[PDB]
Design a protein around this ligand. Structure first.
Ligand code: TVU
Length: 101
């Protein structure tokens, strides 16, 4: 495990604590939300981010943060402002970036 992998594992653990229901734990399936894959062109979630860390696909912290923002942006485009998914996405986006400093 490289230093970057160790840091991103730490960030990911702390980010996922902000999603206790696990709305962002796995990809949003079309089974869960029919037509999701036809609207959101670049899906992302914490589970995929974990796999990318393990595969050593993040070569910088910036790349990791970009995937986190993508996940949140997707939720804020697919869902209307008055939904639990939008509200949590916005909350954790700001709180997450603050945490990572
Ligand atoms: C059954 O477990 C889940 C239940 C819901 C979700 C989920 C997560 N995220 C991030 C979403 O953006 C999301 C959006 C969902 C949804 O049903 N959207 C519709 C209702 C809200 S809307 O009308 O604004 C857009 C259409 S379900 C869902 C994911 C799940 O597993 C990880």
């Amino acid at each position: 495990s490289t230093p970057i992998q160790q840091l991103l594992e730490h960030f990911l653990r702390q980010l996922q604590r902000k999603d206790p229901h696990g709305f962002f734990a796995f990809p949003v399936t079309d089974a869960i939300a029919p037509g999701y894959s036809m609207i959101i062109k670049h899906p992302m979630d914490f589970g995929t981010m974990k796999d990318k860390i393990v595969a050593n696909e993040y070569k910088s912290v910036t790349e990791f943060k970009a995937d986190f923002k993508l996940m949140c942006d997707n939720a804020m485009t697919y869902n209307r402002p008055d939904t639990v998914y939008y509200k949590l996405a916005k909350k954790i986006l700001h709180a997450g970036f603050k945490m990572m400093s």
